[PDB]
């Protein structure tokens, strides 16, 4: 991935930020330095106790004072470093967010066209948070770790030579499963339709089994590595003690110096180990930072903030287009506009009529400086827009289009965007100027009415009213309208038309009209054709062509209960891992006690006795390392097995529930294919990790606590109190050792509103206003984050210092213990050793598991896999609609259907067109049971569809779509997919190929039907893929064919061949076509035109033409 070094991470920093960084770096170095000095004093004290084992009160007091000063130093240094680093992160991220929004608002509309709004918002939030977390504390820990590393090596090199420290001592598996998941999920419709539930369940099962085998192998490798590291650690212990023994026999160094240097080098090596996740997090933060720094570092030639530009004042309105020629930035190949020119004098109503989609919004956008004219000149009042400043240009022109959007704020604030200089008298005068919203809502507040996302949702008419009022606030000289009359009720058209007529009194307006609302409204109307100008003329004159006007119709989490219930089957693995973990906890304190003995026994000036004791302790310690190795390996194996098996079961359950589930659930943004795949990939692993790991860690910690407690009870009541006043007071320090995010979401919401409606926010030049609102809303979360940073720094410093404070407090009791002599000098050694060696996943996994459980426990509107219902006999084909209604589930606020009485029988060829766009494939999806009908009944040979087996119905009907998705496998199985009820031989595939005029293609290539598909193999074009998809559908020979735009979005040459294949398929069986070309409809039995989401015909093509049907004018 694209990285930048550390330089492009701190580019944003002032004097104060840099000095805070330097103070934090110095204090981090202080923390690192104190880390080894503690072990230095520990070893020196070990030696002092050894000498006194055979002149200790003053030394003990000096040690106590040294530990106290070290504790205070670490407290102060840790507080300062964490707090200062967090403050630097806060300031940098505040500047980053400010500049990032500044550049978003400034970068041209093209960048948004090449960047999805939701994707850009996710990028903003995630990347900014990643930068904040990487810079602040993680970098501090990295600095501390490296400082400790260098300090440990420098002390080793300056003392205790040791002969130079003893010469210095899943994707590969889950790729197939992810590919299968992507295939079934992206192609959800095709897998569902062909009853490919069981087959794809089986393929996922097989790939999951392979993935589980690979995961077990990787667990073996990783845990063998961990056991090897433990064996190397214990060999290091044995070698260090062996060298120290030689030293004491050879009289060069002093006892304990070797122990000190050994502890220092091991702590250095393992701290170097601990930084690896931290440096990986730093690298991820740096990558996100490069992405953000790329976004900010952009200065497009189109600019709104540049004050460089002419700002005249004699504006009356004279818009000239001279040889304009533009190509879209996201597809510069297309010739959207070519050689367009047009004249618009001040105060003349000029409108344009042409083909839909092509020439309507282009002129409005270009006059708004959305995209610079590639060629040509656009002049306003004899001044070019280029020489004219963008802010001034946009301010004087009002623009309104078909998508009325109102921002998340009261009406008063929404119309405040018209201008800054609008106070109560001005706002009320402007509202009166609207002369359409003279009334008000409930809460008789006179324009002070909270209108949020849901608060008092209003109809399109009212939104157009308020939008026109906001536009009129600024009295713009030029008005641009892109079919304002659309997506509105049957009574607001007159209101909006009258309002615009009143607005037109003393102004220049260009409305681009194409729809049925009103085309003769204007005074002068011109014609556009594929961007170019046909001619400009008066409306009455334009009747001469007779081809423009008469061409129209005249969740609840769980404390790991269900996870354990699911794993209950794995007694041998869970229980064995728990027992091994319990043994490990049993052993940790025994390790402490044996180490205590081995260090203490050094007070032995003899030679043979010391030799034998050291040798025996080395042997037993090696055996202990071995038993720890075997226990760790066994527990790792067992927990890997349990985790991988749980992940397999959860993936299988999620997949099974997904297959059972309906399709409507998939269309929501949450259930996007990418998000669903990421969830299935990550959440399962997280839940696998946490459940077992929590058990193991809890068992280990409770075992350590109980073991220390019992040893303390054996040693004495004072030692019991010592354990209680060190380890379970250490409970908080070591456990809680360880939002403003939601408050941020309050501002990310206004950010999303801004970026999503970028067209509008750019139209009124309210970049600074939305910036200021963003800043005001971010002010509070910034302060909260600073306070939270202070609190976290304080708590972390206290937890860090509590270790040294407990060390010091140990003496407060050891002094009495030695003086009063209630014990022997072993309890102190034991407590110090135990506390020394004592020295997230659960939270994420609980959320992941809750997601999974809620996923495998839904109640679909219709259960796909369930078999309750009927399995009637031979189906002849008779689909009757009894006044069926439907509403789009994800967006019910846009009724897509208002009544269906479609009638088809065995052999009828009823043709649909779906040209309106409203409900193209909704009718096809209705039959496939992808969505439950809201009303009516779908009678099939005397029976409905609500109480029918979906499998049987989906079996007997052949669905063909426009996107022939082929599966990443051999053509043989790709065609065999058509019949998942039974296994198919080669003859049926031969017949399907013959009836698809495709064998001519497959006979040439030697591989033939077994030819591989994919990307590097035999790549096929649109026509070949369409014909093979038709073959796959026709394999089963269904009794009713439904095709939706089958011959659409494909090469012109292939239209004839695909149509011929379709006529071959539609032989002796009922067919429903939603094709665009009327050539296919020409040889049709009867036709039902699909207009306004309602049927408006049912009959023959000949009668359709005779009565001047819609096709006569819809020919083009």
């Amino acid at each position: 991935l694209p990285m930048v070094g550390p330089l492009a991470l701190f580019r944003f920093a002032d004097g104060k930020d840099i000095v805070l960084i330097f103070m934090g770096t110095v204090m981090s170095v202080a923390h690192g330095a104190v880390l080894p000095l503690m072990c230095i004093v520990f070893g020196d004290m070990t030696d002092s106790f050894i000498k006194d084992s055979m002149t200790l009160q003053e030394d003990m007091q000096s040690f106590a004072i040294y530990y106290s000063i070290m504790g205070f130093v670490v407290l102060v240094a840790a507080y300062m470093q964490v707090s200062f680093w967090a403050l630097a992160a806060g300031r940098q991220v505040r500047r980053i967010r400010k500049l990032f929004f500044h550049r978003i608002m400034q970068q041209d509309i093209g960048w948004f066209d090449v960047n999805e709004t939701g994707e850009l918002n996710t990028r903003l939030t995630d990347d900014v948070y990643k930068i904040q977390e990487g810079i602040g504390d993680k970098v501090g820990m990295l600095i501390q770790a490296f400082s400790t590393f260098i300090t440990s090596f420098i002390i080793g090199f300056v003392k205790g030579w040791k002969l130079t420290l003893v010469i210095l001592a899943e994707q590969t598996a889950y790729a197939k499963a992810g590919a299968v998941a992507e295939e079934v999920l992206s192609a959800i419709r095709t897998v569902f339709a062909f009853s490919g539930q069981d087959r794809e369940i089986k393929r996922y099962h097989k790939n999951l089994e392979d993935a589980k085998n690979m995961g077990i192998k990787k667990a073996i490798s990783a845990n063998i590595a961990m056991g090897f590291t433990f064996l190397m650690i214990y060999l290091s212990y044995a070698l260090a003690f062996w060298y120290g023994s030689i030293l004491i026999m050879s009289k060069e160094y002093t006892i304990g110096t070797v122990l000190t240097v050994f502890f220092v080098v091991l702590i250095g090596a393992f701290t170097m180990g601990q930084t690896s996740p931290n440096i990986q997090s730093f690298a991820s933060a740096r990558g996100a930072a490069h992405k953000v720094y790329s976004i900010i570092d952009n200065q497009p030639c189109i600019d709104s903030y540049s004050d460089a530009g002419f700002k005249p004042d004699s504006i009356k309105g004279n818009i000239e287009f001279r040889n304009i020629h533009f190509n879209y930035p996201s597809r510069p190949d297309v010739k959207i506009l070519n050689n367009m020119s047009l004249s618009v004098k001040s105060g003349q109503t000029i409108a344009l009529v042409g083909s839909s989609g092509c020439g309507k919004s282009t002129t409005i956008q270009l006059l708004q400086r959305f995209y610079d004219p590639q060629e040509g000149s656009v002049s306003i009042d004899t001044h070019d827009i280029r020489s004219l400043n963008v802010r001034y240009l946009r301010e004087m022109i009002g623009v309104v289009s078909q998508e009325p959007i109102l921002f998340a704020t009261t009406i008063a604030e929404n119309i405040k965007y018209g201008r800054p200089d609008v106070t109560q008298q001005e706002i009320e005068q402007a509202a009166k100027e609207a002369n359409a919203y003279d009334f008000i809502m409930n809460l008789p507040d006179k324009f002070e009415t909270l209108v949020g996302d849901r608060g008092t949702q209003m109809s399109g008419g009212q939104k157009q009213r308020i939008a026109i009022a906001r536009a009129l606030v600024r009295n713009p000289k030029i008005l641009l309208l892109d079919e304002a009359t659309s997506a509105l009720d049957a009574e607001s058209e007159t209101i909006v038309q009258a309002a615009l007529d009143k607005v037109r009194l003393g102004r220049t307006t260009i409305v681009v009209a194409h729809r049925l609302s009103t085309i003769r409204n204007a005074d002068v109307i011109a014609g556009f054709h594929k961007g170019d100008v046909i001619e400009l003329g008066t409306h009455s004159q334009l009747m001469e062509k007779q081809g423009v006007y008469y061409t129209l119709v005249t969740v609840p989490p769980v404390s790991f209960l269900k996870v354990m219930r699911l794993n209950l089957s794995e007694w041998p693995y869970m229980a064995l891992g728990t027992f091994c973990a319990i043994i490990n906890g049993m052993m940790q304190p025994l390790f402490a006690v044996i180490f205590s003995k081995i260090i203490a026994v050094f007070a032995e000036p003899n030679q043979e006795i010391v030799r034998q004791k050291s040798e025996f302790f080395s042997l037993m310690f090696a055996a202990i390392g071995g038993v720890t190795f075997v226990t760790m390996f066994l527990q790792g194996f067992c927990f890997g097995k349990s985790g991988e098996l749980l992940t397999l079961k959860l993936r299988l359950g999620a997949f099974k529930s997904m297959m059972r589930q309906d399709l409507g659930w998939f269309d929501n943004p949450k259930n996007s294919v990418g998000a669903l795949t990421t969830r299935l990939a990550t959440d399962a692993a997280q839940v696998q990790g946490a459940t077992g790991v929590r058990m193991a860690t809890l068992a280990q910690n409770i075992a350590n606590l109980g073991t220390s407690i019992i040893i303390s009870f054996v040693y004495g009541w004072e030692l019991t109190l010592l354990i209680l006043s060190v380890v379970p007071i250490m409970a908080v320090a070591g456990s809680v050792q360880m939002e403003d995010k939601k408050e941020l979401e309050k501002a990310g919401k206004i950010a999303t509103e801004a970026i999503e409606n970028i067209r509008t926010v750019a139209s009124l030049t309210r970049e600074p206003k939305f910036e200021s609102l963003y800043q005001e809303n971010l002010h509070v979360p910034y302060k909260n984050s600073q306070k939270k940073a202070h609190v976290y720094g304080f708590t972390f410093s206290f937890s860090q210092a509590m270790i040294y404070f407990a060390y010091a407090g140990c003496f407060r009791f050891g002094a009495w213990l030695i003086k009063e002599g209630r014990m022997d000098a072993e309890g102190v050694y034991l407590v110090i050793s135990a506390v020394l060696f004592g020295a997230p996943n659960y939270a994420k996994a609980k959320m992941s598991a809750s997601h999974l459980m809620m996923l495998m426990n839904r109640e679909p509107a219709i259960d796909n896999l369930s078999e309750e219902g009927q399995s009637p006999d031979k189906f002849d084909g008779n689909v009757r609609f009894e006044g069926v209604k439907f509403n789009y589930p994800s967006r019910p606020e846009v009724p897509i259907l208002r009544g269906l009485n479609l009638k088809v029988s065995k052999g009828e060829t009823l043709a649909l067109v779906g040209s309106s766009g409203c409900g193209k494939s909704t009718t096809i999806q209705l039959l496939e049971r992808f969505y439950d009908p809201m009303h009516g009944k779908v009678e099939l040979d005397g029976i409905s569809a609500k109480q029918l087996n979906i499998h049987w119905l989906r079996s007997q009907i052949g669905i063909v779509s426009q996107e022939p998705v082929l599966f990443d496998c051999t053509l043989a199985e790709n065609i065999a997919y058509g019949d998942n009820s039974r296994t198919v031989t080669l003859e049926e595939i031969q017949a399907a190929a013959k009836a698809a005029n495709i064998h001519s293609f497959i006979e040439n290539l030697p591989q033939g039907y077994d030819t591989q598909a994919g990307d590097k193999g035999t790549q096929l074009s649109g026509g070949q893929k369409q014909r093979i998809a038709i073959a796959r559908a026709i394999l089963r020979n269904p009794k009713l064919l439904l095709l939706d735009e089958a011959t659409s979005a494909l090469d012109t040459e292939s239209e004839k061949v695909v149509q011929e294949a379709l006529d071959q398929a539609s032989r002796g069986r009922t067919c429903i076509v939603v094709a665009h070309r009327l050539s296919t409809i020409q040889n049709a039995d009867r036709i039902a035109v699909f207009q306004a989401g309602v049927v408006v015909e049912q009959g023959t093509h000949q009668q359709l033409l005779a009565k001047k049907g819609i096709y006569s004018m819809l020919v083009n």
Side-chain angles (χ1 to χ4, degrees), residues 34-49 58-75 260 800-812 828-829 832-833 835-836:
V34 61
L35 252 77
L37 289 152
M38 185 57 171
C39 80
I40 291 164
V41 58
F42 152 45
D44 210 359
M45 201 166 98
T46 321
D47 299 332
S48 63
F49 284 150
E58 77 297 354
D59 324 285
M60 162 265 306
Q61 284 299 347
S62 85
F63 291 135
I65 288 321
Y66 225 136
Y67 294 123
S68 294
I69 174 56
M70 291 155 98
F72 224 116
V73 165
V74 64
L75 168 150
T260 46
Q800 294 283 311
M802 161 75 160
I803 292 151
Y804 304 85
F805 287 117
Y807 264 73
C810 304
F811 294 0
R812 181 74 284 176
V828 297
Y829 256 127
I832 298 326
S833 34
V835 70
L836 169 41

Side-chain angles (χ1 to χ4, degrees), residues 854-914:
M854 162 285 307
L855 193 147
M856 42 180 328
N857 292 120
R858 290 187 84 271
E859 194 63 28
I862 198 85
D863 194 346
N864 283 305
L865 208 75
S866 191
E867 312 57 9
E868 77 300 15
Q870 291 90 255
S871 299
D873 203 358
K874 195 259 181 178
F875 179 69
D876 53 350
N878 332 101
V879 177
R880 278 83 163 285
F881 289 72
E882 275 61 72
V884 152
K885 306 289 187 291
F886 169 94
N887 188 359
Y888 191 128
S890 193
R891 197 56 32 73
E893 62 87 21
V894 58
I896 193 57
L897 183 66
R898 65 166 174 280
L900 295 176
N901 171 337
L902 256 299
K903 158 60 176 284
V904 196
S905 303
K906 156 39 203 77
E908 288 52 7
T909 304
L910 180 50
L912 320 176
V913 292

